[PDB]
Enzyme design. Structure first.
Site, PDB file in Angstrom:
ATOM      1  N   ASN A  29     -10.056 -40.818 -18.247  1.00 25.80           N
ATOM      2  CA  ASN A  29     -10.810 -41.910 -18.733  1.00 25.80           C
ATOM      3  C   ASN A  29     -10.580 -43.090 -17.706  1.00 25.80           C
ATOM      4  O   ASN A  29     -11.283 -44.732 -18.361  1.00 25.80           O
ATOM      5  CB  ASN A  29     -10.273 -42.013 -20.184  1.00 25.80           C
ATOM      6  CG  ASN A  29      -9.128 -43.170 -20.256  1.00 25.80           C
ATOM      7  OD1 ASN A  29      -8.090 -43.051 -19.287  1.00 25.80           O
ATOM      8  ND2 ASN A  29      -8.543 -43.915 -20.917  1.00 25.80           N
TER       9      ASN A  29
ATOM     10  N   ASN B 218      -9.463 -50.476 -13.498  1.00 25.96           N
ATOM     11  CA  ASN B 218     -11.094 -50.496 -13.548  1.00 25.96           C
ATOM     12  C   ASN B 218     -11.955 -51.464 -15.342  1.00 25.96           C
ATOM     13  O   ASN B 218     -11.429 -50.896 -16.164  1.00 25.96           O
ATOM     14  CB  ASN B 218     -12.184 -49.470 -13.463  1.00 25.96           C
ATOM     15  CG  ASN B 218     -13.879 -49.282 -13.990  1.00 25.96           C
ATOM     16  OD1 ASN B 218     -14.515 -49.681 -13.893  1.00 25.96           O
ATOM     17  ND2 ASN B 218     -13.528 -47.420 -14.314  1.00 25.96           N
TER      18      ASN B 218
ATOM     19  N   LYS C 215     -16.278 -35.142  -2.324  1.00 25.91           N
ATOM     20  CA  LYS C 215     -15.076 -34.135  -3.837  1.00 25.91           C
ATOM     21  C   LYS C 215     -14.194 -33.398  -2.954  1.00 25.91           C
ATOM     22  O   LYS C 215     -15.534 -32.075  -4.113  1.00 25.91           O
ATOM     23  CB  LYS C 215     -16.062 -34.992  -5.089  1.00 25.91           C
ATOM     24  CG  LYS C 215     -15.884 -33.906  -6.375  1.00 25.91           C
ATOM     25  CD  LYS C 215     -14.263 -35.252  -6.729  1.00 25.91           C
ATOM     26  CE  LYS C 215     -13.995 -34.571  -7.940  1.00 25.91           C
ATOM     27  NZ  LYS C 215     -13.574 -35.273  -8.930  1.00 25.91           N
TER      28      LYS C 215
ATOM     29  N   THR D 200     -13.373 -29.751 -10.955  1.00 23.95           N
ATOM     30  CA  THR D 200     -13.774 -27.955 -12.303  1.00 23.95           C
ATOM     31  C   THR D 200     -14.133 -28.926 -13.149  1.00 23.95           C
ATOM     32  O   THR D 200     -14.971 -29.960 -12.952  1.00 23.95           O
ATOM     33  CB  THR D 200     -12.079 -28.727 -12.418  1.00 23.95           C
ATOM     34  OG1 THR D 200     -11.465 -29.551 -13.108  1.00 23.95           O
ATOM     35  CG2 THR D 200     -10.877 -27.987 -11.532  1.00 23.95           C
TER      36      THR D 200
END
Ligand SMILES: [Cl-]
Ligand SMILES: [Cl-]
Ligand SMILES: [Cl-]
Ligand SMILES: [Cl-]
Lengths: 220, 220
Positions: B12, B177, B37, B41
């Protein structure tokens, strides 16, 4: 012995449920076990009797009616923060004293076969500027049971904690709290848990499969 | 140089947003920066062009129109699991080859001032039975930027990762963040972040306050 610290990978792990189940199981097997919550944040004891310590107290009073909240939980704060911050803000003249806690917790080994000590926050959460929950567990000389959640992401969380725990001088087990309605764990995360365990000297277990194993661990 | 790995404390955290903001900032300052990247997945490229690599590609094509998805992302799986499991199940004859990835990623240092390499899953997530994301970052000789979420619990997650990172031979920064509507971070978690930083040689930063600091770090 015996003393078992219980911590969690994350706030969503359900460690209190697991601690209560393990103590219920131990008691039922004739291993007289008490549940302690020495430090708790986010509480308001005038208004809510459903804190971890209250749940513990309920269970404990099946063995000793005379127990009260203050016998099993010693530093309690309204703030949700880390204990160090909650203390500094609410009780600036009363730092958490882990020497005092070590004496109080270890006194219960006179009257109980197993003393379960639940932490708050996680292994790295600060108690004092010098000590975190893991440092407190180390001071206690307790064994450690670390409860993991069962969601996608548990691999990283378990292995982060495993690295920290294996790097310190204590006997530990990591157990996943697997919920009944989880339709994904076995096909998404369990394959790696199984691989990991083949390559490790200390496997990650599923709590629900491991009551006997964890009691054996705690009393070893 | 220069190469910067980006990982996250948890699923998250919003690392992709942060990676894109930092590369936008670097580009705008004349530091020609690409976003890679290498492993992803949970994707389905026939149906969804909103994967991390697709977002990266969009940004990257402002510098080089000829780039395609396969130039910036090399191992892509439908399964949401850890890359090792997704690989074993979907592509049993094609293990992830980190030597090949190291060559591919490092080739971009010919044409870019900064190569940002976003991981998947977290530092401890398995890529091969022998290597996790951190091992791959170490093989690359990259600097590391680890993005944290901004919710209650971030202290334990940051410090778990800090312990792992400080215990290995790499230059890293942890950045939170912080979301605009977060009405709790500053009063609940920031007080300890501030204390920690007074006592640390490597402080935890707030991403949004730190674009210049993180660019300086990446290019040092
Ligand atoms: Cl809990
Ligand atoms: Cl997982
Ligand atoms: Cl992300
Ligand atoms: Cl926090």
């Amino acid at each position: 012995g015996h003393m078992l610290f219980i911590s969690a990978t994350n706030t969503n792990a359900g460690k209190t449920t697991c601690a209560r189940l393990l103590a219920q199981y131990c008691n039922a097997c004739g291993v007289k076990t008490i549940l302690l919550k020495p430090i708790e944040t986010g509480v308001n004891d005038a208004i809510n009797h459903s804190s971890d310590a209250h749940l513990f107290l309920q269970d404990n009073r099946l063995l000793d009616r005379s127990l009260t909240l203050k016998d099993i939980s010693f530093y309690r704060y309204h703030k949700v923060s880390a204990p160090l911050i909650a203390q500094q803000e609410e009780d600036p003249n009363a730092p958490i004293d882990t020497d005092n806690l070590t004496q109080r917790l270890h006194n219960f080994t006179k009257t109980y076969d197993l003393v379960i000590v639940e932490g708050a926050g996680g292994l790295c959460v600060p108690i004092t500027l010098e000590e975190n929950m893991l440092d407190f567990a180390l001071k206690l000389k307790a064994k450690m049971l670390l409860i993991s959640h069962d969601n996608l992401g548990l691999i990283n969380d378990c292995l982060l904690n495993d690295f920290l725990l294996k790097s310190h001088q204590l006997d530990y087990k990591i157990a996943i709290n697997l919920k009944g309605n989880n339709t994904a764990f076995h096909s998404i995360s369990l394959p790696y848990i199984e691989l990991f365990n083949t390559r490790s000297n200390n496997p990650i277990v599923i709590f629900q499969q491991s009551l006997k194993v964890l009691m054996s661990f705690a009393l070893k």
